């Protein structure tokens with residue numbers, strides 16, 4: 001029988017644990033699949049081993065493993081697949097599919113669009129600065145830039161500047177330094193993050209200093225588990241379960 005195994009990265013923040021668990025629970029009613037389990041790589045239970053084993057114990061013959069990830073980096077390519085292989089080696093008879101992070105999807109740009117609209121200031125011909133966490137893995141910058149291009153195509157903005165909190169450039173603090181001008185162009189700052197936290201507070205403080213220089217700057221709320229993010233993730237789940245060409249086939253001989 002078919003199963004879905006949702007995999008979040010997990011958190012050490014009690015609230016982040018609750019938000020991720022509740023989001024994954026609320027996903028279940030949208031998927032016409034009878035066996036569905038949530039799990040987390042780290043810091044938070046159910047572990048991946050527990051959720052996978054629950055799928056098998058409920059009689060699953062096929063397990064669609066879907067990572068709750070905005071972008072593609074070490075978690076999606078390596079850490080999570082290794083945990084999958086570690087537990088799945090013990091059940092060699094179980095067929096596995098493994099999904100993609102949300103990535104470049106029209107729905108997440110729509111989530112960004114609604115975060116922009118929420119400020120209530122005209123966005124026509126406005127600049128957008130899209131802040132992702134960042135990674136040394138080049139796929140992350142590649143995907144954030146792709147999302148920026150999609151936002152550019154879908155919303156009548158002047159330009160979209162992807163930038164990052166860490167690991168790869170440009171850092172959002174350099175972009176901010178180039179935006180102290182005030183040329184009459186409105187600038188929206190959109191944090192491309194699933195959760196608030198240390199980095200959101202840092203962004204808040206840095207945007208305050210920038211607003212001290214340039215009053216035409218507006219910080220939106222972070223993307224979070226926006227309904228359009230939910231739509232995009234549900235797309236991922238459905239495509240992983242269908243696996244129509246076998247493009248999501250996964251083994252049990254360590255692929256990462």
Ligand code: NI
Nearest residue numbers: 078079082256
């Ligand atoms: Ni390794």
Ligand code: NI
Nearest residue numbers: 110111114228
């Ligand atoms: Ni909408």
